[PDB]
UniProtKB/Swiss-Prot annotation, chains A, B, C, D, E, F:
Residues reported to bind Cu cation: 14
Annotated consequence of substituting residue 3 to F: No effect on osmotic stress-induced phosphorylation
PTM sites of type Phosphoserine: 51
Ranges where the record places region 4 X 11 AA tandem repeats of [EGS]-K-T-K-[EQ]-[GQ]-V-X(4): 1-31
Sequence repeat placement: 6-20, 21-31
Location within or outside the cell: Cytoplasm; Membrane; Nucleus; Synapse
Record's function text: Neuronal protein that plays several roles in synaptic activity such as regulation of synaptic vesicle trafficking and subsequent neurotransmitter release. Participates as a monomer in synaptic vesicle exocytosis by enhancing vesicle priming, fusion and dilation of exocytotic fusion pores. Mechanistically, acts by increasing local Ca(2+) release from microdomains which is essential for the enhancement of ATP-induced exocytosis.
PTM annotation: Phosphorylated, predominantly on serine residues. Phosphorylation by CK1 appears to occur on residues distinct from the residue phosphorylated by other kinases. Hallmark lesions of neurodegenerative synucleinopathies contain alpha-synuclein that is modified by nitration of tyrosine residues and possibly by dityrosine cross-linking to generated stable oligomers.
Official protein name in the record: Alpha-synuclein
Disease cited in the entry: Genetic alterations of SNCA resulting in aberrant polymerization into fibrils, are associated with several neurodegenerative diseases (synucleinopathies). SNCA fibrillar aggregates represent the major non A-beta component of Alzheimer disease amyloid plaque, and a major component of Lewy body inclusions. They are also found within Lewy body (LB)-like intraneuronal inclusions, glial inclusions and axonal spheroids in neurodegeneration with brain iron accumulation type 1.
Domain of life the protein comes from: Eukaryota
Span within the parent record: 37 to 97 of 140
Summary of the tissues where the protein is detected: Highly expressed in presynaptic terminals in the central nervous system. Expressed principally in brain.
Domain notes: The 'non A-beta component of Alzheimer disease amyloid plaque' domain (NAC domain) is involved in fibrils formation. The middle hydrophobic region forms the core of the filaments. The C-terminus may regulate aggregation and determine the diameter of the filaments.
Protein backbone atom coordinates (compact mmCIF):
# COMPACT_ATOMS: atom_id res chain seq x y z
CA UNK A 1 0.00 0.00 0.00
CA UNK A 2 3.12 2.14 0.30
CA UNK A 3 6.81 1.52 -0.44
CA UNK A 4 9.39 4.32 -0.55
CA UNK A 5 12.86 3.22 -1.54
CA UNK A 6 15.65 5.78 -1.40
CA UNK A 7 19.33 5.29 -2.25
CA UNK A 8 18.68 1.58 -1.88
CA UNK A 9 21.46 -0.64 -3.19
CA UNK A 10 21.04 -4.35 -3.87
CA UNK A 11 23.50 -6.72 -5.49
CA UNK A 12 25.99 -3.92 -6.02
CA UNK A 13 29.77 -3.58 -6.28
CA UNK A 14 31.44 -0.19 -6.33
CA UNK A 15 34.75 1.48 -5.58
CA UNK A 16 37.08 -1.40 -6.39
CA UNK A 17 40.71 -1.08 -7.44
CA UNK A 18 42.65 -4.22 -8.34
CA UNK A 19 46.11 -4.93 -9.69
CA UNK A 20 47.18 -8.35 -10.96
CA UNK A 21 50.76 -8.93 -12.08
CA UNK A 22 51.25 -12.52 -13.23
CA UNK A 23 54.22 -13.71 -15.24
CA UNK A 24 52.46 -16.86 -16.44
CA UNK A 25 48.98 -18.34 -16.07
CA UNK A 26 47.80 -21.64 -17.59
CA UNK A 27 44.54 -23.58 -17.52
CA UNK A 28 44.35 -27.15 -18.85
CA UNK A 29 40.82 -28.53 -18.68
CA UNK A 30 40.07 -32.04 -19.94
CA UNK A 31 36.36 -32.80 -19.98
CA UNK A 32 35.10 -31.00 -16.88
CA UNK A 33 34.39 -27.40 -15.94
CA UNK A 34 36.68 -24.52 -14.99
CA UNK A 35 35.84 -20.96 -13.89
CA UNK A 36 38.74 -18.59 -13.26
CA UNK A 37 39.12 -14.93 -12.37
CA UNK A 38 35.71 -13.42 -11.66
CA UNK A 39 36.02 -9.86 -10.34
CA UNK A 40 33.57 -7.01 -9.81
CA UNK A 41 30.40 -8.91 -10.68
CA UNK A 42 26.91 -8.10 -9.40
CA UNK A 43 23.56 -9.76 -10.01
CA UNK A 44 20.00 -9.66 -8.74
CA UNK A 45 17.37 -12.31 -9.45
CA UNK A 46 13.66 -12.30 -8.64
CA UNK A 47 11.93 -15.69 -8.64
CA UNK A 48 14.84 -17.66 -10.05
CA UNK A 49 17.96 -19.51 -8.95
CA UNK A 50 21.02 -17.30 -9.17
CA UNK A 51 24.60 -18.46 -9.59
CA UNK A 52 27.66 -16.29 -10.09
CA UNK A 53 30.63 -18.61 -10.65
CA UNK A 54 29.26 -22.15 -10.69
CA UNK A 55 31.43 -24.79 -12.37
CA UNK A 56 29.24 -27.88 -12.59
CA UNK A 57 30.66 -31.25 -13.53
CA UNK A 58 29.08 -33.38 -16.19
CA UNK A 59 25.39 -34.17 -15.75
CA UNK A 60 23.91 -37.55 -16.67
CA UNK A 61 20.45 -39.12 -16.59
CA UNK B 1 -0.94 0.99 -4.70
CA UNK B 2 2.15 3.17 -4.38
CA UNK B 3 5.85 2.61 -5.10
CA UNK B 4 8.39 5.43 -5.18
CA UNK B 5 11.89 4.39 -6.15
CA UNK B 6 14.64 6.99 -5.98
CA UNK B 7 18.33 6.55 -6.81
CA UNK B 8 17.73 2.82 -6.46
CA UNK B 9 20.54 0.65 -7.76
CA UNK B 10 20.18 -3.07 -8.45
CA UNK B 11 22.68 -5.39 -10.06
CA UNK B 12 25.14 -2.56 -10.57
CA UNK B 13 28.92 -2.17 -10.80
CA UNK B 14 30.53 1.25 -10.83
CA UNK B 15 33.82 2.95 -10.06
CA UNK B 16 36.19 0.11 -10.87
CA UNK B 17 39.83 0.48 -11.89
CA UNK B 18 41.81 -2.63 -12.79
CA UNK B 19 45.30 -3.29 -14.11
CA UNK B 20 46.41 -6.69 -15.39
CA UNK B 21 50.02 -7.21 -16.49
CA UNK B 22 50.55 -10.80 -17.65
CA UNK B 23 53.56 -11.93 -19.65
CA UNK B 24 51.84 -15.11 -20.87
CA UNK B 25 48.39 -16.63 -20.53
CA UNK B 26 47.26 -19.94 -22.06
CA UNK B 27 44.02 -21.92 -22.03
CA UNK B 28 43.89 -25.49 -23.36
CA UNK B 29 40.38 -26.92 -23.22
CA UNK B 30 39.68 -30.44 -24.49
CA UNK B 31 35.98 -31.25 -24.56
CA UNK B 32 34.68 -29.47 -21.47
CA UNK B 33 33.91 -25.89 -20.52
CA UNK B 34 36.16 -22.98 -19.55
CA UNK B 35 35.27 -19.44 -18.44
CA UNK B 36 38.13 -17.03 -17.78
CA UNK B 37 38.45 -13.37 -16.88
CA UNK B 38 35.03 -11.90 -16.18
CA UNK B 39 35.28 -8.35 -14.84
CA UNK B 40 32.78 -5.54 -14.33
CA UNK B 41 29.64 -7.48 -15.22
CA UNK B 42 26.14 -6.71 -13.96
CA UNK B 43 22.81 -8.42 -14.60
CA UNK B 44 19.25 -8.37 -13.35
CA UNK B 45 16.65 -11.05 -14.08
CA UNK B 46 12.93 -11.10 -13.29
CA UNK B 47 11.25 -14.51 -13.32
CA UNK B 48 14.20 -16.43 -14.72
CA UNK B 49 17.34 -18.25 -13.60
CA UNK B 50 20.37 -15.99 -13.80
CA UNK B 51 23.97 -17.10 -14.20
CA UNK B 52 27.00 -14.89 -14.67
CA UNK B 53 30.01 -17.17 -15.22
CA UNK B 54 28.68 -20.73 -15.29
CA UNK B 55 30.90 -23.33 -16.96
CA UNK B 56 28.75 -26.46 -17.20
CA UNK B 57 30.22 -29.79 -18.14
CA UNK B 58 28.69 -31.94 -20.83
CA UNK B 59 25.01 -32.78 -20.41
CA UNK B 60 23.58 -36.18 -21.34
CA UNK B 61 20.14 -37.80 -21.30
CA UNK C 1 -1.94 2.00 -9.34
CA UNK C 2 1.13 4.21 -9.00
CA UNK C 3 4.83 3.70 -9.71
CA UNK C 4 7.35 6.55 -9.78
CA UNK C 5 10.86 5.55 -10.75
CA UNK C 6 13.57 8.18 -10.57
CA UNK C 7 17.27 7.78 -11.38
CA UNK C 8 16.71 4.05 -11.04
CA UNK C 9 19.56 1.91 -12.33
CA UNK C 10 19.24 -1.81 -13.03
CA UNK C 11 21.77 -4.11 -14.64
CA UNK C 12 24.20 -1.24 -15.14
CA UNK C 13 27.97 -0.81 -15.35
CA UNK C 14 29.55 2.63 -15.37
CA UNK C 15 32.81 4.37 -14.59
CA UNK C 16 35.22 1.55 -15.39
CA UNK C 17 38.86 1.97 -16.41
CA UNK C 18 40.88 -1.12 -17.30
CA UNK C 19 44.37 -1.74 -18.61
CA UNK C 20 45.53 -5.13 -19.90
CA UNK C 21 49.15 -5.60 -20.98
CA UNK C 22 49.73 -9.18 -22.15
CA UNK C 23 52.75 -10.28 -24.13
CA UNK C 24 51.07 -13.48 -25.37
CA UNK C 25 47.63 -15.04 -25.04
CA UNK C 26 46.55 -18.36 -26.58
CA UNK C 27 43.33 -20.38 -26.56
CA UNK C 28 43.24 -23.94 -27.90
CA UNK C 29 39.75 -25.41 -27.77
CA UNK C 30 39.10 -28.94 -29.05
CA UNK C 31 35.41 -29.79 -29.13
CA UNK C 32 34.08 -28.03 -26.04
CA UNK C 33 33.27 -24.46 -25.08
CA UNK C 34 35.48 -21.52 -24.10
CA UNK C 35 34.54 -17.99 -23.00
CA UNK C 36 37.38 -15.55 -22.32
CA UNK C 37 37.65 -11.89 -21.41
CA UNK C 38 34.21 -10.47 -20.72
CA UNK C 39 34.42 -6.91 -19.38
CA UNK C 40 31.88 -4.13 -18.87
CA UNK C 41 28.77 -6.10 -19.78
CA UNK C 42 25.26 -5.38 -18.53
CA UNK C 43 21.95 -7.12 -19.18
CA UNK C 44 18.38 -7.11 -17.94
CA UNK C 45 15.82 -9.83 -18.68
CA UNK C 46 12.10 -9.92 -17.91
CA UNK C 47 10.46 -13.35 -17.94
CA UNK C 48 13.43 -15.23 -19.33
CA UNK C 49 16.58 -17.02 -18.21
CA UNK C 50 19.59 -14.72 -18.40
CA UNK C 51 23.20 -15.79 -18.79
CA UNK C 52 26.22 -13.55 -19.25
CA UNK C 53 29.25 -15.79 -19.78
CA UNK C 54 27.96 -19.36 -19.86
CA UNK C 55 30.22 -21.94 -21.53
CA UNK C 56 28.10 -25.09 -21.78
CA UNK C 57 29.61 -28.41 -22.73
CA UNK C 58 28.11 -30.57 -25.42
CA UNK C 59 24.44 -31.45 -25.01
CA UNK C 60 23.05 -34.86 -25.96
CA UNK C 61 19.64 -36.52 -25.92
CA UNK D 1 83.47 5.62 -28.47
CA UNK D 2 80.49 3.27 -28.46
CA UNK D 3 76.87 3.62 -27.34
CA UNK D 4 74.18 1.08 -28.21
CA UNK D 5 70.71 1.99 -27.06
CA UNK D 6 67.94 -0.55 -27.53
CA UNK D 7 64.27 -0.22 -26.56
CA UNK D 8 65.36 2.60 -24.28
CA UNK D 9 62.52 4.69 -22.91
CA UNK D 10 63.01 8.10 -21.30
CA UNK D 11 60.36 10.55 -20.17
CA UNK D 12 57.59 8.26 -21.38
CA UNK D 13 53.97 7.56 -20.45
CA UNK D 14 52.09 4.65 -21.97
CA UNK D 15 49.15 2.38 -21.29
CA UNK D 16 46.96 4.78 -19.32
CA UNK D 17 43.18 4.59 -19.00
CA UNK D 18 41.36 7.30 -17.07
CA UNK D 19 37.73 8.12 -16.40
CA UNK D 20 36.60 11.42 -14.88
CA UNK D 21 32.93 11.98 -14.09
CA UNK D 22 32.40 15.43 -12.57
CA UNK D 23 29.02 17.10 -12.26
CA UNK D 24 30.51 20.58 -11.82
CA UNK D 25 34.00 22.07 -11.87
CA UNK D 26 34.85 25.75 -11.38
CA UNK D 27 38.08 27.75 -11.29
CA UNK D 28 38.10 31.39 -10.15
CA UNK D 29 41.56 32.93 -10.42
CA UNK D 30 42.12 36.57 -9.45
CA UNK D 31 45.61 37.77 -10.31
CA UNK D 32 47.74 34.70 -9.62
CA UNK D 33 48.41 31.41 -11.37
CA UNK D 34 46.36 28.21 -11.64
CA UNK D 35 47.20 24.88 -13.30
CA UNK D 36 44.53 22.18 -13.27
CA UNK D 37 44.16 18.70 -14.71
CA UNK D 38 47.43 17.61 -16.30
CA UNK D 39 47.29 13.97 -17.39
CA UNK D 40 49.49 11.78 -19.60
CA UNK D 41 52.28 14.29 -20.17
CA UNK D 42 55.89 13.43 -20.96
CA UNK D 43 58.93 15.62 -21.55
CA UNK D 44 62.68 15.34 -21.94
CA UNK D 45 65.11 18.26 -21.76
CA UNK D 46 68.84 18.35 -22.47
CA UNK D 47 70.75 21.30 -21.03
CA UNK D 48 67.73 23.24 -19.83
CA UNK D 49 65.43 23.57 -16.84
CA UNK D 50 62.30 21.48 -17.28
CA UNK D 51 58.95 22.09 -15.63
CA UNK D 52 55.72 20.20 -16.23
CA UNK D 53 52.99 21.90 -14.20
CA UNK D 54 54.58 24.94 -12.57
CA UNK D 55 52.20 27.69 -11.42
CA UNK D 56 54.45 30.60 -10.47
CA UNK D 57 53.11 33.60 -8.61
CA UNK D 58 53.79 37.11 -9.78
CA UNK D 59 57.44 38.04 -10.27
CA UNK D 60 58.80 41.49 -9.39
CA UNK D 61 62.17 43.22 -9.59
CA UNK E 1 84.35 3.55 -24.19
CA UNK E 2 81.35 1.23 -24.16
CA UNK E 3 77.74 1.62 -23.02
CA UNK E 4 75.02 -0.90 -23.87
CA UNK E 5 71.56 0.06 -22.70
CA UNK E 6 68.77 -2.46 -23.16
CA UNK E 7 65.10 -2.10 -22.17
CA UNK E 8 66.23 0.72 -19.91
CA UNK E 9 63.42 2.85 -18.53
CA UNK E 10 63.95 6.25 -16.93
CA UNK E 11 61.33 8.73 -15.80
CA UNK E 12 58.53 6.47 -16.99
CA UNK E 13 54.91 5.81 -16.04
CA UNK E 14 52.99 2.91 -17.54
CA UNK E 15 50.03 0.67 -16.84
CA UNK E 16 47.88 3.10 -14.86
CA UNK E 17 44.10 2.94 -14.53
CA UNK E 18 42.31 5.68 -12.61
CA UNK E 19 38.69 6.54 -11.92
CA UNK E 20 37.60 9.85 -10.40
CA UNK E 21 33.93 10.45 -9.59
CA UNK E 22 33.45 13.91 -8.08
CA UNK E 23 30.09 15.61 -7.76
CA UNK E 24 31.61 19.08 -7.34
CA UNK E 25 35.12 20.53 -7.41
CA UNK E 26 36.00 24.21 -6.93
CA UNK E 27 39.25 26.18 -6.87
CA UNK E 28 39.32 29.82 -5.73
CA UNK E 29 42.79 31.32 -6.03
CA UNK E 30 43.39 34.96 -5.07
CA UNK E 31 46.89 36.12 -5.95
CA UNK E 32 48.99 33.04 -5.26
CA UNK E 33 49.62 29.73 -7.00
CA UNK E 34 47.54 26.56 -7.26
CA UNK E 35 48.34 23.21 -8.90
CA UNK E 36 45.64 20.54 -8.86
CA UNK E 37 45.23 17.06 -10.29
CA UNK E 38 48.48 15.93 -11.89
CA UNK E 39 48.30 12.29 -12.97
CA UNK E 40 50.47 10.07 -15.18
CA UNK E 41 53.28 12.55 -15.77
CA UNK E 42 56.88 11.65 -16.57
CA UNK E 43 59.94 13.81 -17.19
CA UNK E 44 63.68 13.49 -17.59
CA UNK E 45 66.14 16.39 -17.43
CA UNK E 46 69.87 16.44 -18.16
CA UNK E 47 71.82 19.38 -16.73
CA UNK E 48 68.82 21.35 -15.53
CA UNK E 49 66.53 21.71 -12.53
CA UNK E 50 63.39 19.65 -12.94
CA UNK E 51 60.04 20.30 -11.28
CA UNK E 52 56.80 18.44 -11.87
CA UNK E 53 54.10 20.17 -9.82
CA UNK E 54 55.72 23.20 -8.21
CA UNK E 55 53.38 25.98 -7.06
CA UNK E 56 55.66 28.87 -6.12
CA UNK E 57 54.35 31.88 -4.27
CA UNK E 58 55.07 35.38 -5.46
CA UNK E 59 58.72 36.28 -5.96
CA UNK E 60 60.11 39.71 -5.10
CA UNK E 61 63.50 41.41 -5.32
CA UNK F 1 85.32 1.47 -19.90
CA UNK F 2 82.28 -0.81 -19.85
CA UNK F 3 78.68 -0.37 -18.71
CA UNK F 4 75.92 -2.85 -19.54
CA UNK F 5 72.48 -1.85 -18.36
CA UNK F 6 69.65 -4.33 -18.80
CA UNK F 7 66.00 -3.92 -17.81
CA UNK F 8 67.17 -1.11 -15.55
CA UNK F 9 64.39 1.06 -14.16
CA UNK F 10 64.97 4.46 -12.57
CA UNK F 11 62.39 6.97 -11.43
CA UNK F 12 59.56 4.74 -12.61
CA UNK F 13 55.93 4.13 -11.65
CA UNK F 14 53.97 1.26 -13.13
CA UNK F 15 50.98 -0.94 -12.42
CA UNK F 16 48.87 1.52 -10.44
CA UNK F 17 45.09 1.41 -10.10
CA UNK F 18 43.35 4.17 -8.17
CA UNK F 19 39.74 5.08 -7.47
CA UNK F 20 38.70 8.41 -5.95
CA UNK F 21 35.04 9.06 -5.14
CA UNK F 22 34.61 12.53 -3.63
CA UNK F 23 31.27 14.28 -3.30
CA UNK F 24 32.85 17.73 -2.90
CA UNK F 25 36.37 19.13 -2.98
CA UNK F 26 37.30 22.80 -2.51
CA UNK F 27 40.58 24.73 -2.46
CA UNK F 28 40.70 28.36 -1.33
CA UNK F 29 44.18 29.82 -1.64
CA UNK F 30 44.84 33.45 -0.70
CA UNK F 31 48.35 34.57 -1.59
CA UNK F 32 50.41 31.46 -0.90
CA UNK F 33 50.99 28.14 -2.64
CA UNK F 34 48.87 24.99 -2.88
CA UNK F 35 49.62 21.63 -4.52
CA UNK F 36 46.89 18.99 -4.46
CA UNK F 37 46.42 15.52 -5.89
CA UNK F 38 49.65 14.34 -7.49
CA UNK F 39 49.42 10.70 -8.57
CA UNK F 40 51.55 8.46 -10.78
CA UNK F 41 54.39 10.90 -11.39
CA UNK F 42 57.98 9.95 -12.20
CA UNK F 43 61.06 12.07 -12.83
CA UNK F 44 64.80 11.70 -13.25
CA UNK F 45 67.30 14.56 -13.10
CA UNK F 46 71.02 14.56 -13.84
CA UNK F 47 73.02 17.48 -12.43
CA UNK F 48 70.05 19.49 -11.22
CA UNK F 49 67.78 19.89 -8.21
CA UNK F 50 64.61 17.87 -8.61
CA UNK F 51 61.28 18.56 -6.94
CA UNK F 52 58.01 16.75 -7.51
CA UNK F 53 55.33 18.52 -5.46
CA UNK F 54 57.00 21.53 -3.85
CA UNK F 55 54.70 24.34 -2.70
CA UNK F 56 57.02 27.20 -1.78
CA UNK F 57 55.76 30.24 0.07
CA UNK F 58 56.52 33.72 -1.12
CA UNK F 59 60.18 34.57 -1.64
CA UNK F 60 61.62 37.99 -0.80
CA UNK F 61 65.03 39.64 -1.03
Amino acid sequence: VLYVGSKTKEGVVHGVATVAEKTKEQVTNVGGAVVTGVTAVAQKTVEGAGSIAAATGFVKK
